[PDB]
Coordinates of C-alpha atoms and ligand atoms in Angstrom, one line a residue:
Chain Y
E7 CA 14.5 -47.4 43.2
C8 CA 13.4 -44.1 41.7
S9 CA 11.3 -44.2 38.5
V10 CA 13.3 -42.3 35.8
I11 CA 11.3 -41.4 32.6
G12 CA 13.1 -39.1 30.3
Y13 CA 14.1 -36.0 32.3
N14 CA 11.7 -36.8 35.2
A15 CA 12.9 -38.7 38.3
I16 CA 10.0 -39.8 40.5
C17 CA 11.3 -40.8 44.0
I18 CA 8.1 -40.5 46.0
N19 CA 7.9 -42.7 49.1
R20 CA 11.0 -44.9 48.5
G21 CA 12.3 -44.8 52.1
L22 CA 15.2 -42.7 51.1
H23 CA 17.5 -41.1 53.8
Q24 CA 19.6 -39.1 51.3
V25 CA 19.6 -37.9 47.8
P26 CA 20.4 -41.0 45.7
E27 CA 22.9 -41.1 42.8
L28 CA 20.8 -40.6 39.6
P29 CA 21.6 -39.6 36.0
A30 CA 23.0 -36.0 35.9
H31 CA 20.8 -34.7 33.0
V32 CA 17.4 -34.8 34.7
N33 CA 15.6 -31.4 35.1
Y34 CA 12.5 -32.6 37.1
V35 CA 13.1 -34.4 40.5
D36 CA 10.4 -35.3 43.0
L37 CA 11.7 -36.4 46.4
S38 CA 8.5 -36.1 48.4
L39 CA 7.4 -38.4 51.3
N40 CA 10.8 -39.8 52.3
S41 CA 12.9 -39.7 55.5
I42 CA 15.6 -37.2 54.5
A43 CA 16.8 -35.6 57.7
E44 CA 19.2 -33.1 56.3
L45 CA 20.1 -31.6 52.9
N46 CA 23.6 -30.2 52.4
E47 CA 25.9 -29.0 49.7
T48 CA 26.7 -32.6 48.7
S49 CA 23.0 -33.5 48.3
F50 CA 22.7 -32.1 44.7
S51 CA 26.3 -32.3 43.6
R52 CA 25.5 -34.5 40.7
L53 CA 22.0 -33.3 39.7
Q54 CA 23.1 -29.9 38.3
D55 CA 21.2 -27.6 36.0
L56 CA 17.8 -28.9 37.4
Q57 CA 14.6 -26.9 36.8
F58 CA 12.0 -28.4 39.2
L59 CA 12.7 -29.9 42.6
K60 CA 10.1 -31.2 45.1
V61 CA 11.0 -32.4 48.7
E62 CA 7.6 -32.4 50.4
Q63 CA 6.5 -34.0 53.7
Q64 CA 9.7 -35.6 54.9
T65 CA 9.8 -37.0 58.4
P66 CA 9.5 -34.0 60.9
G67 CA 12.5 -31.8 61.3
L68 CA 14.1 -31.5 57.8
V69 CA 17.3 -29.3 58.0
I70 CA 18.4 -27.3 54.9
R71 CA 22.0 -26.4 55.4
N72 CA 24.0 -23.5 54.0
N73 CA 24.7 -23.7 50.2
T74 CA 22.4 -26.6 49.6
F75 CA 21.3 -25.2 46.3
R76 CA 24.5 -23.5 45.1
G77 CA 25.1 -24.4 41.4
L78 CA 21.5 -25.1 40.6
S79 CA 21.5 -22.2 38.2
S80 CA 18.6 -23.6 36.1
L81 CA 16.2 -24.1 39.1
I82 CA 12.9 -22.2 38.6
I83 CA 10.6 -23.9 41.1
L84 CA 11.5 -25.2 44.6
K85 CA 8.7 -26.9 46.6
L86 CA 9.4 -27.8 50.2
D87 CA 5.8 -28.0 51.7
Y88 CA 4.6 -30.0 54.8
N89 CA 8.0 -30.3 56.4
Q90 CA 7.1 -29.9 60.1
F91 CA 9.6 -27.9 62.1
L92 CA 11.6 -27.1 59.0
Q93 CA 15.0 -25.7 60.0
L94 CA 16.5 -23.3 57.6
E95 CA 20.0 -22.1 58.0
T96 CA 20.5 -18.5 56.9
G97 CA 22.3 -19.4 53.7
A98 CA 19.9 -22.3 52.9
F99 CA 18.9 -20.6 49.6
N100 CA 22.3 -19.3 48.5
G101 CA 23.0 -19.5 44.8
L102 CA 19.3 -19.3 43.7
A103 CA 19.4 -15.9 42.0
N104 CA 17.2 -17.2 39.2
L105 CA 14.5 -18.9 41.3
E106 CA 11.0 -17.7 40.5
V107 CA 8.7 -20.0 42.6
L108 CA 9.2 -21.0 46.2
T109 CA 6.6 -22.9 48.3
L110 CA 7.1 -23.3 52.0
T111 CA 3.6 -24.4 53.0
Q112 CA 2.8 -25.9 56.4
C113 CA 6.4 -25.7 57.7
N114 CA 5.7 -24.2 61.2
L115 CA 7.4 -21.0 60.0
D116 CA 6.8 -17.7 61.7
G117 CA 7.1 -14.0 60.7
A118 CA 10.9 -14.0 61.0
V119 CA 11.0 -16.0 57.7
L120 CA 10.0 -12.7 56.0
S121 CA 11.9 -10.2 58.2
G122 CA 15.1 -12.3 58.3
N123 CA 17.6 -12.8 55.6
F124 CA 16.3 -16.2 54.4
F125 CA 14.9 -14.9 51.1
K126 CA 17.6 -12.2 50.4
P127 CA 19.3 -14.2 47.7
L128 CA 16.1 -14.8 45.7
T129 CA 16.4 -11.7 43.6
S130 CA 14.4 -13.1 40.6
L131 CA 11.7 -14.5 42.9
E132 CA 8.2 -14.0 41.5
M133 CA 5.8 -16.3 43.5
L134 CA 6.1 -17.1 47.2
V135 CA 3.6 -19.6 48.8
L136 CA 3.7 -19.5 52.6
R137 CA 0.3 -21.1 53.3
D138 CA -0.6 -22.5 56.7
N139 CA 2.3 -21.5 58.8
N140 CA 2.5 -19.5 62.1
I141 CA 3.1 -16.0 60.6
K142 CA 1.4 -13.6 62.9
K143 CA 2.6 -10.4 61.4
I144 CA 3.6 -9.7 57.8
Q145 CA 6.8 -7.6 57.8
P146 CA 8.9 -8.0 54.7
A147 CA 12.5 -6.9 55.1
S148 CA 13.8 -4.1 52.8
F149 CA 15.5 -6.4 50.3
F150 CA 12.0 -7.2 48.9
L151 CA 12.3 -3.7 47.3
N152 CA 14.9 -5.1 44.8
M153 CA 13.0 -8.3 44.1
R154 CA 11.8 -6.5 40.9
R155 CA 9.7 -9.5 39.7
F156 CA 7.9 -10.4 42.9
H157 CA 4.2 -10.5 42.1
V158 CA 2.5 -13.5 43.9
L159 CA 2.3 -13.9 47.7
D160 CA 0.0 -16.5 49.3
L161 CA -0.4 -16.3 53.1
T162 CA -3.7 -18.2 53.4
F163 CA -4.3 -20.0 56.8
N164 CA -1.7 -18.0 58.7
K165 CA -3.1 -16.6 62.0
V166 CA -2.4 -13.0 61.1
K167 CA -3.4 -10.5 63.9
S168 CA -3.6 -7.5 61.5
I169 CA -2.1 -5.9 58.4
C170 CA -1.0 -2.2 58.6
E171 CA 0.9 0.3 56.5
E172 CA 4.2 0.0 58.4
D173 CA 4.0 -3.8 58.2
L174 CA 3.9 -3.8 54.5
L175 CA 6.3 -0.9 54.0
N176 CA 8.6 -3.0 51.9
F177 CA 5.8 -4.0 49.5
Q178 CA 5.2 -0.4 48.5
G179 CA 5.6 0.4 44.8
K180 CA 4.9 -3.2 43.8
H181 CA 2.1 -4.5 41.6
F182 CA 0.9 -7.9 42.9
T183 CA -0.9 -10.1 40.4
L184 CA -2.3 -12.2 43.2
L185 CA -2.2 -11.3 46.9
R186 CA -4.0 -14.1 48.7
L187 CA -4.9 -13.2 52.3
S188 CA -7.5 -15.9 52.8
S189 CA -8.7 -17.3 56.1
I190 CA -6.3 -15.3 58.3
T191 CA -9.0 -14.0 60.6
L192 CA -7.5 -10.5 61.3
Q193 CA -8.8 -10.9 64.8
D194 CA -7.6 -7.5 66.0
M195 CA -9.4 -5.5 63.3
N196 CA -12.8 -5.2 64.9
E197 CA -14.9 -2.0 65.3
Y198 CA -13.4 -1.3 68.8
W199 CA -9.7 -1.6 67.9
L200 CA -7.6 1.4 69.0
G201 CA -5.1 0.6 66.3
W202 CA -7.1 1.8 63.2
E203 CA -5.6 5.3 62.9
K204 CA -2.0 4.1 63.4
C205 CA -2.8 1.2 60.9
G206 CA -3.1 3.6 57.9
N207 CA -3.2 2.0 54.5
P208 CA -1.5 -1.4 54.3
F209 CA -1.7 -1.3 50.5
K210 CA -0.4 2.2 50.1
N211 CA 1.1 2.9 46.6
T212 CA 0.4 -0.7 45.7
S213 CA -1.8 -2.1 43.0
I214 CA -3.3 -5.7 43.0
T215 CA -4.8 -7.6 40.1
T216 CA -6.5 -10.3 42.2
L217 CA -7.1 -9.5 45.9
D218 CA -8.2 -12.6 47.7
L219 CA -9.7 -11.8 51.2
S220 CA -12.1 -14.8 51.5
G221 CA -12.8 -16.7 54.7
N222 CA -12.1 -13.7 57.1
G223 CA -15.5 -13.1 58.6
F224 CA -15.7 -9.5 57.3
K225 CA -18.5 -8.2 59.5
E226 CA -20.1 -5.2 57.7
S227 CA -18.4 -2.7 60.1
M228 CA -15.0 -4.3 59.3
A229 CA -15.4 -4.3 55.5
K230 CA -16.3 -0.6 55.7
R231 CA -13.3 0.3 57.9
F232 CA -10.9 -1.8 55.9
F233 CA -11.9 -0.5 52.5
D234 CA -11.9 3.0 53.8
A235 CA -8.4 2.3 55.1
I236 CA -7.1 1.0 51.7
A237 CA -9.1 3.7 49.7
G238 CA -7.6 4.3 46.2
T239 CA -5.9 0.9 45.8
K240 CA -6.3 -0.3 42.2
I241 CA -7.9 -3.8 42.3
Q242 CA -9.2 -5.6 39.3
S243 CA -10.7 -8.7 41.0
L244 CA -11.9 -8.6 44.6
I245 CA -12.7 -11.9 46.2
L246 CA -14.7 -11.8 49.4
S247 CA -16.3 -15.2 49.3
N248 CA -17.0 -17.1 52.5
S249 CA -17.6 -13.9 54.5
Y250 CA -19.6 -15.7 57.1
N251 CA -20.1 -12.5 59.2
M252 CA -21.0 -10.1 56.3
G253 CA -24.8 -10.5 55.7
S254 CA -27.3 -10.3 58.5
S255 CA -29.0 -13.5 57.2
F256 CA -32.4 -15.1 57.4
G257 CA -33.5 -14.9 60.9
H258 CA -32.3 -13.0 64.0
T259 CA -28.6 -12.4 63.7
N260 CA -26.4 -9.7 65.2
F261 CA -24.7 -8.6 62.0
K262 CA -25.9 -6.0 59.5
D263 CA -26.3 -6.2 55.7
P264 CA -24.0 -3.9 53.7
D265 CA -25.3 -0.6 52.5
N266 CA -24.2 2.2 50.2
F267 CA -21.3 3.1 52.6
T268 CA -19.8 -0.4 53.1
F269 CA -17.6 -0.4 49.9
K270 CA -17.2 3.4 49.4
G271 CA -13.4 3.2 49.7
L272 CA -13.3 1.2 46.4
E273 CA -14.9 3.9 44.4
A274 CA -11.7 4.7 42.5
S275 CA -10.2 1.1 42.6
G276 CA -11.4 0.2 39.1
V277 CA -12.8 -3.1 40.2
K278 CA -13.8 -5.3 37.2
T279 CA -15.0 -8.5 39.0
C280 CA -16.3 -9.0 42.5
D281 CA -17.0 -12.3 44.3
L282 CA -19.3 -12.1 47.3
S283 CA -20.5 -15.7 47.1
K284 CA -21.1 -18.1 50.0
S285 CA -21.8 -15.3 52.5
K286 CA -25.0 -14.5 54.5
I287 CA -26.4 -11.5 52.8
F288 CA -30.1 -11.2 53.3
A289 CA -31.1 -7.9 51.6
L290 CA -29.6 -5.9 48.8
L291 CA -29.8 -2.3 50.1
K292 CA -30.0 0.7 47.9
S293 CA -26.7 1.8 46.2
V294 CA -24.8 -1.0 48.0
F295 CA -22.8 -1.5 44.8
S296 CA -22.9 2.1 43.6
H297 CA -19.1 2.4 44.1
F298 CA -18.3 -0.4 41.7
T299 CA -18.7 1.8 38.6
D300 CA -16.3 -0.3 36.5
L301 CA -17.6 -3.7 37.6
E302 CA -18.2 -6.2 34.8
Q303 CA -18.9 -9.4 36.8
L304 CA -20.7 -9.7 40.2
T305 CA -21.6 -13.0 41.8
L306 CA -23.9 -13.1 44.9
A307 CA -24.4 -16.9 44.6
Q308 CA -25.1 -19.0 47.7
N309 CA -26.1 -16.3 50.1
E310 CA -29.3 -15.9 51.9
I311 CA -30.8 -13.1 49.8
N312 CA -34.6 -12.9 50.3
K313 CA -35.2 -9.2 49.5
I314 CA -33.8 -6.8 46.8
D315 CA -34.6 -3.2 47.5
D316 CA -35.1 -0.6 44.9
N317 CA -31.9 0.7 43.2
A318 CA -29.8 -2.0 44.7
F319 CA -27.9 -2.2 41.4
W320 CA -27.5 1.6 41.0
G321 CA -24.3 2.7 39.3
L322 CA -23.6 -0.6 37.5
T323 CA -23.7 0.9 34.1
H324 CA -21.1 -1.6 32.8
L325 CA -22.1 -4.8 34.6
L326 CA -22.3 -7.7 32.2
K327 CA -22.8 -10.8 34.4
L328 CA -24.9 -11.1 37.5
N329 CA -25.0 -14.5 39.4
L330 CA -27.8 -14.7 42.0
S331 CA -28.0 -18.6 42.2
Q332 CA -28.8 -20.4 45.4
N333 CA -30.6 -17.7 47.4
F334 CA -34.2 -17.4 48.7
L335 CA -35.7 -14.9 46.2
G336 CA -39.5 -15.1 46.5
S337 CA -40.8 -13.1 43.5
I338 CA -39.4 -11.1 40.7
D339 CA -40.7 -7.8 39.5
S340 CA -39.7 -5.1 37.0
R341 CA -38.2 -2.8 39.7
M342 CA -35.7 -5.3 41.0
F343 CA -33.4 -5.2 37.9
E344 CA -33.4 -1.5 37.1
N345 CA -30.0 0.2 36.4
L346 CA -28.6 -2.9 34.5
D347 CA -29.2 -1.8 30.8
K348 CA -26.1 -3.6 29.6
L349 CA -26.6 -6.9 31.5
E350 CA -25.9 -10.0 29.3
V351 CA -25.9 -13.0 31.7
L352 CA -28.3 -13.4 34.6
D353 CA -28.3 -16.5 36.8
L354 CA -31.4 -16.9 38.9
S355 CA -31.3 -20.7 39.3
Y356 CA -31.8 -22.6 42.5
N357 CA -34.1 -20.0 44.1
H358 CA -37.6 -20.0 45.5
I359 CA -39.3 -17.9 42.8
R360 CA -43.0 -18.5 42.4
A361 CA -43.9 -15.4 40.4
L362 CA -42.5 -13.3 37.6
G363 CA -43.8 -9.7 37.3
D364 CA -45.3 -8.5 34.0
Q365 CA -42.3 -6.5 33.0
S366 CA -39.6 -8.4 35.0
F367 CA -37.0 -8.3 32.3
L368 CA -38.0 -5.0 30.6
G369 CA -34.7 -3.2 31.2
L370 CA -32.4 -5.8 29.8
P371 CA -32.3 -5.3 26.0
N372 CA -28.8 -6.8 25.7
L373 CA -29.5 -9.9 27.8
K374 CA -28.0 -13.0 26.1
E375 CA -28.3 -15.7 28.9
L376 CA -31.1 -16.1 31.5
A377 CA -31.1 -19.0 33.9
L378 CA -34.4 -19.6 35.8
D379 CA -34.2 -23.4 36.5
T380 CA -34.8 -25.1 39.8
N381 CA -37.4 -22.8 41.2
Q382 CA -41.1 -23.1 41.9
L383 CA -42.7 -21.4 38.8
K384 CA -46.0 -22.8 37.7
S385 CA -46.8 -20.3 34.9
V386 CA -45.4 -17.1 33.3
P387 CA -47.2 -14.0 32.1
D388 CA -47.9 -13.7 28.4
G389 CA -45.2 -11.9 26.6
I390 CA -42.7 -11.9 29.4
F391 CA -39.9 -12.9 27.0
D392 CA -40.9 -11.2 23.8
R393 CA -38.6 -8.2 24.2
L394 CA -35.4 -10.2 25.0
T395 CA -34.4 -10.1 21.3
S396 CA -30.8 -10.9 21.9
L397 CA -31.5 -13.9 24.1
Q398 CA -29.4 -17.0 23.2
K399 CA -29.8 -19.4 26.2
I400 CA -32.6 -19.9 28.7
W401 CA -33.0 -22.5 31.5
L402 CA -36.6 -23.3 32.6
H403 CA -36.4 -27.0 33.6
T404 CA -37.0 -28.5 37.0
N405 CA -40.1 -26.3 37.6
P406 CA -43.6 -27.6 38.4
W407 CA -45.0 -26.0 35.3
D408 CA -48.8 -25.9 35.0
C409 CA -49.4 -26.9 31.4
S410 CA -53.1 -26.3 31.3
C411 CA -54.6 -24.4 28.3
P412 CA -55.0 -21.7 27.5
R413 CA -52.8 -20.6 30.4
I414 CA -49.7 -22.4 28.9
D415 CA -50.5 -21.2 25.4
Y416 CA -47.9 -18.4 25.3
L417 CA -45.1 -20.3 26.9
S418 CA -45.6 -23.5 24.9
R419 CA -45.8 -21.6 21.6
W420 CA -42.9 -19.4 22.5
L421 CA -40.6 -22.3 23.5
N422 CA -41.4 -24.1 20.2
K423 CA -40.6 -21.2 17.9
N424 CA -37.4 -20.5 19.9
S425 CA -36.6 -24.2 20.4
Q426 CA -32.9 -23.8 19.6
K427 CA -32.3 -21.6 22.6
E428 CA -33.8 -23.7 25.4
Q429 CA -31.2 -25.3 27.6
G430 CA -32.3 -28.5 29.5
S431 CA -35.9 -28.5 28.3
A432 CA -38.7 -27.4 30.6
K433 CA -41.2 -30.2 31.4
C434 CA -44.9 -30.3 32.4
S435 CA -45.5 -31.6 35.9
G436 CA -47.4 -34.9 35.7
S437 CA -47.2 -35.9 32.1
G438 CA -43.6 -34.9 31.7
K439 CA -43.8 -33.8 28.1
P440 CA -41.7 -30.9 26.8
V441 CA -43.5 -27.6 27.2
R442 CA -42.3 -26.7 23.7
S443 CA -44.5 -29.4 22.2
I444 CA -47.9 -28.4 23.7
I445 CA -50.3 -26.8 21.2
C446 CA -53.3 -25.3 22.8
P447 CA -56.6 -25.7 20.8
Chain O
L13 CA -3.1 -26.2 43.6
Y14 CA -0.5 -24.1 41.9
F15 CA 1.4 -26.8 40.0
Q16 CA 0.5 -30.1 38.6
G17 CA 4.0 -31.4 38.1
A18 CA 5.8 -28.4 36.5
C19 CA 2.7 -27.2 34.7
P20 CA 0.9 -24.2 36.2
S21 CA -2.3 -25.6 37.7
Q22 CA -4.5 -23.2 35.7
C23 CA -2.9 -24.4 32.4
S24 CA -2.6 -27.6 30.5
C25 CA 0.9 -28.7 29.4
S26 CA 2.1 -31.2 26.8
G27 CA 5.7 -31.5 25.5
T28 CA 6.9 -27.9 25.2
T29 CA 3.4 -26.5 24.8
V30 CA 1.7 -24.6 27.6
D31 CA -2.0 -24.0 27.1
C32 CA -3.5 -21.3 29.3
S33 CA -6.3 -20.4 27.0
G34 CA -10.0 -20.1 27.9
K35 CA -9.4 -20.2 31.6
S36 CA -10.8 -16.8 32.6
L37 CA -7.3 -15.7 33.5
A38 CA -6.7 -12.1 34.6
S39 CA -2.9 -12.3 34.4
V40 CA -0.1 -14.5 33.0
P41 CA 0.5 -17.5 35.1
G42 CA 3.8 -17.8 36.9
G43 CA 6.1 -20.8 36.7
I44 CA 5.9 -21.4 32.9
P45 CA 8.8 -23.7 32.2
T46 CA 11.8 -22.2 30.4
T47 CA 11.6 -24.9 27.7
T48 CA 8.2 -23.7 26.5
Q49 CA 8.1 -23.3 22.7
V50 CA 4.4 -22.7 22.3
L51 CA 2.4 -20.5 24.7
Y52 CA -1.4 -20.2 24.4
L53 CA -2.9 -17.3 26.4
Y54 CA -5.9 -16.4 24.1
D55 CA -9.5 -16.0 25.2
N56 CA -8.8 -14.7 28.8
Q57 CA -9.4 -11.4 30.6
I58 CA -5.8 -10.2 30.7
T59 CA -5.7 -6.4 30.9
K60 CA -2.0 -5.6 31.2
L61 CA 1.4 -7.3 31.0
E62 CA 4.0 -6.7 33.7
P63 CA 7.5 -5.7 32.4
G64 CA 9.7 -8.6 31.7
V65 CA 6.9 -11.3 31.9
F66 CA 8.4 -13.0 28.8
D67 CA 12.1 -12.3 29.5
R68 CA 12.9 -15.8 30.5
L69 CA 11.0 -17.5 27.7
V70 CA 13.9 -17.4 25.2
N71 CA 12.7 -20.6 23.5
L72 CA 9.2 -19.3 22.5
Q73 CA 8.3 -19.9 18.9
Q74 CA 4.6 -18.9 19.1
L75 CA 2.8 -16.4 21.4
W76 CA -1.0 -16.3 21.2
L77 CA -2.4 -13.2 23.1
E78 CA -5.6 -12.6 21.1
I79 CA -9.0 -12.1 22.7
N80 CA -7.9 -10.3 25.8
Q81 CA -8.3 -6.7 27.1
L82 CA -4.8 -5.4 26.7
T83 CA -4.7 -1.6 26.7
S84 CA -1.0 -1.0 26.2
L85 CA 2.3 -2.9 26.0
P86 CA 5.3 -2.5 28.3
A87 CA 8.5 -1.3 26.7
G88 CA 10.8 -4.2 25.8
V89 CA 8.3 -7.0 26.4
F90 CA 9.3 -8.9 23.2
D91 CA 13.0 -8.0 23.2
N92 CA 14.3 -11.4 24.3
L93 CA 12.1 -13.5 22.0
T94 CA 14.5 -13.7 19.1
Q95 CA 13.1 -17.1 17.9
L96 CA 9.5 -15.7 17.8
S97 CA 7.8 -16.3 14.5
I98 CA 4.1 -16.0 15.5
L99 CA 2.7 -13.1 17.5
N100 CA -1.1 -12.9 17.6
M101 CA -2.7 -9.9 19.3
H102 CA -6.0 -9.4 17.5
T103 CA -9.2 -8.5 19.4
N104 CA -7.5 -6.5 22.2
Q105 CA -7.8 -2.9 23.3
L106 CA -4.4 -1.6 22.0
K107 CA -4.2 2.0 20.7
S108 CA -0.5 1.9 19.8
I109 CA 2.7 -0.2 20.1
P110 CA 5.7 1.2 22.0
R111 CA 8.5 2.5 19.9
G112 CA 10.9 -0.3 18.9
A113 CA 8.7 -3.0 20.4
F114 CA 9.4 -5.4 17.4
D115 CA 13.0 -4.4 16.8
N116 CA 14.4 -7.7 18.2
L117 CA 11.9 -10.1 16.5
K118 CA 14.1 -11.1 13.6
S119 CA 12.4 -14.5 13.3
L120 CA 8.9 -13.0 13.0
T121 CA 6.9 -14.1 10.0
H122 CA 3.2 -13.8 11.1
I123 CA 1.7 -11.0 13.1
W124 CA -2.0 -10.3 13.8
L125 CA -3.1 -6.7 14.7
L126 CA -6.7 -6.3 13.4
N127 CA -9.7 -5.7 15.6
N128 CA -7.8 -3.2 17.8
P129 CA -8.8 0.5 18.3
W130 CA -5.6 1.9 16.9
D131 CA -5.5 5.6 17.7
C132 CA -4.2 7.1 14.4
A133 CA -4.9 10.7 15.2
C134 CA -2.2 10.5 17.9
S135 CA 1.4 10.6 16.9
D136 CA 2.3 7.5 19.0
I137 CA 0.9 5.4 16.1
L138 CA 3.9 6.3 13.9
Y139 CA 6.2 3.5 15.0
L140 CA 3.6 0.9 14.0
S141 CA 2.6 2.5 10.7
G142 CA 6.2 2.8 9.6
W143 CA 6.9 -0.8 10.7
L144 CA 3.8 -2.0 8.8
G145 CA 5.1 -0.2 5.7
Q146 CA 8.4 -2.1 5.9
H147 CA 7.0 -5.5 6.8
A148 CA 3.7 -5.6 5.0
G149 CA 3.7 -9.4 4.2
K150 CA 3.7 -10.4 7.8
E151 CA 0.3 -9.1 8.8
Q152 CA -2.7 -11.4 8.8
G153 CA -5.8 -9.4 8.1
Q154 CA -5.4 -5.6 8.2
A155 CA -5.0 -3.4 11.2
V156 CA -7.2 -0.4 10.8
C157 CA -7.5 3.1 12.3
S158 CA -10.2 3.6 14.8
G159 CA -13.2 5.6 13.5
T160 CA -12.1 6.0 9.9
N161 CA -11.4 2.5 8.7
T162 CA -8.1 3.7 7.1
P163 CA -5.4 1.0 7.4
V164 CA -2.6 1.8 9.8
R165 CA -0.1 1.1 7.1
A166 CA -1.2 4.3 5.3
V167 CA -0.5 6.7 8.1
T168 CA 1.5 9.8 7.2
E169 CA 3.3 12.1 9.7
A170 CA 1.2 15.0 8.4
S171 CA -1.9 13.2 9.6
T172 CA -0.7 12.8 13.1
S173 CA -0.3 15.3 16.0
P174 CA 1.2 15.0 19.5
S175 CA -1.7 17.1 21.0
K176 CA -4.3 14.5 20.0
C177 CA -2.8 11.9 22.4
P178 CA -5.1 11.5 25.5
Ligands
NAG1 C1 25.7 -20.2 57.4 O1 25.9 -18.8 56.8 C2 25.7 -17.8 57.8 C3 25.9 -16.5 57.0 O2 25.7 -15.3 57.9 C4 26.7 -17.9 58.9 O3 26.5 -16.9 59.9 C5 26.6 -19.3 59.6 O4 27.6 -19.5 60.6 C6 26.7 -20.4 58.5 N1 26.5 -21.7 59.1 C7 25.4 -22.2 59.7 C8 25.5 -23.5 60.3 O5 24.4 -21.5 59.8
NAG2 C1 -23.2 -19.1 39.2 O1 -22.6 -19.6 40.4 C2 -22.7 -21.0 40.5 C3 -22.1 -21.3 41.9 O2 -20.7 -21.2 41.8 C4 -22.0 -21.7 39.4 O3 -22.1 -23.1 39.5 C5 -22.5 -21.3 38.0 O4 -21.7 -21.8 37.0 C6 -22.5 -19.7 37.9 N1 -23.2 -19.3 36.7 C7 -22.8 -18.2 36.0 C8 -23.6 -17.9 34.8 O5 -21.9 -17.5 36.4

């Protein structure tokens, strides 16, 4: 009943109660959405070698017996997600010394799956996905020290109380390429918690390429204490999107906006990209990003930013890309974008901008891409764009442009001479003709 | 989310080719199938390679690493790629190549090294310059010394010094 096409055997939702007899040369097998109640050593007796095995979402209670995978010396990826009340015997993964990827998402597993000996045989393991289980504390046993190629751990949607130095002791010395700790709440780590000093640095002697901490609230006081706690950790990309508690927002809230102290612990982290999108930041305070001295990309998209104080971008001598889309900016002036001499891409789309100051883009001699579409601009000052000599792409459409003469004379003439750069074409309100085509008498 | 079949979700796979190019990647994806013969990793933001990243990819015939931000290479990173014929590393941030890095690449026929800031004042350059002198026909374009334009192939031991190695 399985569909066999070359080396792939697709057995999704076939009402199977055991591994069927199939040709012995296949290297990809998908057994998802069946009613297999137990896998044992006889389950994969004939399907040797094998590189990719999927058994997701069986009927509740799948049991994986000792030595189930012994002999599968070619197996690289083993996916077992969405098996409710998954029962693993302690030798369930015996023989998988070459496995690199294991996914055990939504299996009602708890912290003992990391502290017990379940994963001790997986000496070549590189990527472990444990999303959406019941792991309340992250306490890897010591054998993780010898998993020399372990570099990806995903614990998203586990109700983790807190992460501390002693918890992660057996991750020390490691370089993670991706450590995804998204939407785990960290409920205990509030400003009043007595455990902060004992907590130490959870990421001690550990470097991380992409640190994903999205969806965790991250009240300003918490971000400050957390990054102070992990001070010195080398992080290339920091993801803090969906921090619903970070900004103080439009309108009376109880939370504070970040300031020049919030991210101080990351001064020596070498962060290259930072994602703070989909939060509730209302004002950019002075030197709030002054500790990101290596940062190359910064997105603040989809916040509630209404105000940008002076020197908000202080210290960003290397910043190349700034995304400010979907906020509530009211007017742009020359002061707002100081300290961004090297900026090349600026996204100001989907805002509420009604005015551009005379010298708004003065300090951006290297600017290549400027998006200003979907705002409320009716006119621009003469010469506002004449010094952007490196400019390659500009968005000005979906604005209620006032195309009266001679007010529109500069913009209409400028857009025509530079017609190859305009993205989406800016249109006059009312007549709808391209601004680039208007020639004032 | 992580895998579309056996292909890493960030990449596109066809036959034995795995295309991870132009996907704003900061690191090499995990779970690349061991049958991969062609691996595209060009035009990303990869700043380092972890030791052994390619150790399992014994079938690789082409490795495209150009247009990244690599600042050094780990020792032994190519040692298991004995079928490798194409190795493209132009437009990166490399200052030297670790001693013996290409020793095992007996099937190599095309190598790109240009547009890197090779640090020829520093004696670490000497493995590469000697290697280029013995395998001149393989290079596409000309790797050149930073700040002097002098091809790497022409480096003499007299011109180098251990003390000029920051
Ligand atoms: C499986 O292997 C472990 C190894 O310690 C052993 O203790 C256990 O009795 C075996 N059988 C079952 C059913 O767990
Ligand atoms: C800015 O962010 C929005 C929201 O994710 C995205 O659609 C857009 O492509 C981004 N633009 C740039 C230039 O980063």
